[PDB]
Symmetry: D2
Subunit: 317 residues, 4 copies
């Protein structure tokens, strides 16, 4: 029996007998994704080239306006905005949203995969809303996931029950449930990182990657893939299994990916799909942030693979 994103959310929202504020947020966000996807596929570009005589910025304004107008949000953190946005009081609701509205948008001249990442928190403090409400640890996530604008446009939603994937049919503007309660492979055969920083790698990364190119039990070497747009690399990891690594180098001693709206949402999706996500020292979701644009090193993916790396990490102290 067929199921849609809006219909899955409403069925789940009634089963839990909640108020609907979260559904309204999800519906508003889903609508922005459909608009962003329309622009990413360059629909309507002919008028820009004078047929009748800022893609990351447009994405940002789409998500800002659609979330502000859902009456369901109070603090919004975006990669595009230096400070958190504090929703004006008349439109204020109970939720905090952190998002990268167009991840990979720097490599968009090459039509690389791009994506939207989002994380949803229930405001915890009872103070007047401020940036501090967006500083919760990943454990506190109520919902998170991403839209991948690839060969097709897909939405991955992870909440308490698990992870579900919806394929956007652009013919009707509706998201079709195509993968119910997805689970990552226990062990993959692919490693994913930018090996250009090999000169700046921590030795454990060097040992684990060396173990993938020349396996010690003389098994088959892993394949390498690295798109360089995080949604694309993480999503492949989810669908095919394996391990993704953006560790700390010298240009980024605290890692390069942003914790609030890049690492934690992927870490939540991974964990709710049976995978693991670590900074090296601790699980990603346990990190308590202090700044909205702070970075974190991240290694995530299949349980056996992330565990194997963790053994290598302890070996080097």
């Amino acid at each position: 029996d067929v199921n849609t994103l809006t219909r899955f959310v409403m069925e789940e929202g009634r089963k839990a007998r909640g108020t609907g504020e979260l559904t309204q947020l999800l519906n508003s966000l889903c609508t922005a994704v459909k608009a962003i996807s329309s622009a990413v596929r360059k629909a309507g570009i002919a008028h820009l080239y004078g047929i009748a005589g800022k893609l990351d910025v447009l994405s940002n304004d789409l998500v800002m306006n659609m979330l502000k107008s859902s009456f369901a949000t109070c603090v919004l953190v975006s990669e595009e905005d230096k400070h958190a946005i504090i929703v004006e009081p008349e439109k204020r609701g109970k939720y905090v949203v952190c998002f990268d509205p167009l991840d990979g948008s720097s490599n968009i001249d090459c039509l690389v995969s791009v994506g939207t990442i989002f994380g949803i928190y229930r405001k915890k403090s009872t103070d007047e809303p401020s940036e501090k409400d967006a500083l919760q640890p990943g454990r506190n996530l109520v919902a998170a996931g991403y839209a991948l604008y690839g060969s097709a446009t897909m939405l991955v939603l992870a909440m308490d029950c698990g992870v579900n994937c919806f394929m956007l049919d652009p013919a009707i503007g509706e998201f079709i449930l195509v993968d119910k309660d997805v689970k990552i492979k226990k062990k993959g055969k692919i490693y994913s990182l930018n090996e250009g920083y090999a000169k700046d790698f921590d030795p454990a990364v060097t040992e684990y990657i060396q173990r993938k190119k020349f396996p010690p039990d003389n098994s088959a070497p892993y394949g390498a893939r690295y798109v360089g747009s995080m949604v694309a690399d993480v999503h492949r990891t989810l669908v095919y299994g394996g391990i993704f690594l953006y560790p700390a180098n010298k240009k980024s001693p605290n890692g390069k990916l942003r914790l609030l709206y890049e690492c934690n949402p992927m870490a939540y999706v991974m964990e709710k799909a049976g995978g693991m996500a670590t900074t090296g020292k601790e699980a990603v979701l346990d990190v308590i942030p202090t700044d909205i644009h702070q970075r974190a090193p991240v290694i995530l993916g299949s349980p056996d693979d992330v565990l194997e790396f963790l053994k290598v990490y302890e070996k080097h102290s």
Copy 2:
């Protein structure tokens, strides 16, 4: 002044006072590309999931039927077919087409970019048409290029005058010229190959890669990218500069990519854009093929970079 692929080809076709058979072929191919794009973006997928109670095969049939019915082709070589297809005589025309109808479609489960690669030859003899007509070297190409099914749909077309890029506007089904006469950077900063099989690297490849991660002059190391879908990795190389390598080792002395419908059209686009493409021993376009599904190693991209690789390659011989 606004310009489309259909309008552009007619302009070049009149300026050259040709018969129109080539323009008819390109228009048919472009229409097949738009039809492929709609399915890759999963338009109408709602009906496959029972809303009222094969993707590379469909691609192959679209190009085949659109080429056969253009009245401009006589022999068609496709990745999907063991033997070359001979157009029935009533629909027979003066051109030979080699294509991969959907390259990278094996990784399409994760929505990575996919593409169609095509190369066009003029039939040289007046014999009865046979596979012998497909075995020209890349030097003989009249037009060649690819469609990238990425974040957007782009058609890159390389003919004698040079390389031009068209963006598909899906609201109107027209390819909008957005890049006239592209030329690749003289030297790039990205290396692109599957470093997972380092255990089996030919030694020159090993050394070339180490020099990219660890420059002896302590200049900047290159970044690594590898989508693992050929159209995507090559198009990025064209847009950003750099080098793509699917090289020969000893386990596969001829590489893995197919010469007729993968290596030659990319070599043509690269060379027509100021780039280089070698197998290590010779330019890709100089190879005289003996079997339509034969393999060839390929290293392509910026001239300074292909030259540097070849400098390392002669060293290990």
Copy 3:
């Protein structure tokens, strides 16, 4: 601030503190409307013509609404112009609402690309019996909501409920219905009459006179304009936008008219009244007719209040 149909329905659903079953109904219906529009615009017809070497549009439309409603968990009885007997939803998918619909009205003339539409009416199941066709035999007064999708130059969804009539434009780049006309109200008097004057030979005498009074005013004012698309959804919606009167009246060859009460006349009458208009059979208001069979017909004259009145004067003038 921008507004979409899905967002508008949820707002009203919370404001009224309902269970959500009705919102789930309209959203599923909205989705079926979007899919119909995709097919009506012949998206993918190139594959139908062997571009790589399935049903008829009104059959497929019916399947879409049926399947989208059955799976909404908000319906128990479905009556369709396409199905002779009312459908009783299986118990697991069973809900508390009864739906009458015309899935593709006017589809007979679609070979000429005339406007076509989906019409729907939504009732609450009143009795506590096991659900049966009888639950569909409620009068139009009992409607919870009603409206129609018009697949014309654009695809517009008109939703009429107690609070009023709202119009949504389908933006196909994103597949969302955009609130574009809030709280619509029909003109008190129009300048258009709409009916099939080819069958004048069989006109009820009041109609013959009323049309003469619109073409040759006794008060020697300006004549009314004539328009008749012949697709009910198109003609009624124009009357809503420009004012005037629409007539599919009763003659002697068809003393009860030809249009169907449950899923054509009642939903159009419901929209008309919630927008300040009128809909009468001549003898009684359309919404007051108590149906005895799900496919029974009824004459309908609707449009601006003043114009339906002038007709009623002439109708009662003819005893």
Copy 4:
């Protein structure tokens, strides 16, 4: 075998061994139709209503810009512009185009069918082009037709060979040939006119209309339809047979429809499909215009039905 509008125009154009200037015209015109369809279906209206915080005028600018840039036009007459536009010398070509880019658009608030009507004449003089070049009779048409934006978008193209109908598949932006070499019914069962102006009907019109409601041979009365958009009413007449009448009354002794870009193109389709079009006094195509915006009464459709009208017209003088 599948065939598109562009491929069909190229085939007939090659068979005639022409320069391509007409094919270039039609391709550019077809692309503007595709753009108007997208806007008329209100694609992208969500941004018009502030999702991130003029339709006939847009229609004209599209056709104007698309025709000027085809390098195939010299004089353009449009319903929207009081004087003919004279294409600038660098973009000049050998064809004259009269069009209504968005006919019936005054009724677009109710989502009535609208259309684009066009007629194409060869430049008459070799002098400096001027309005006199558009003042040719309908007999001189090289090609003419219309795009109907109704429940679907269809292109009706009438040239010397006949009339062919193309359906726009908006999923791929190509017009698909769906009716070859169409011919109108010899006699229909529908008449189509505005009986609201009955007060001023020419007596012949009154008598012919009475003859349709009350047949002397006690056959079936004709059915009545009148959408009020000429393209919609004319296309129905072509597809189902019957008669469309916008005749001369006392309120308008020369009719109200415009002869160059409404009556002349529709009469041509009618004649090329086996139908007829008269003003009452003469064939529409034989009227030589004196001013580009002159009006003409028109009665068109199936031949036997127009003949029955013409008998009554000759009877009444």
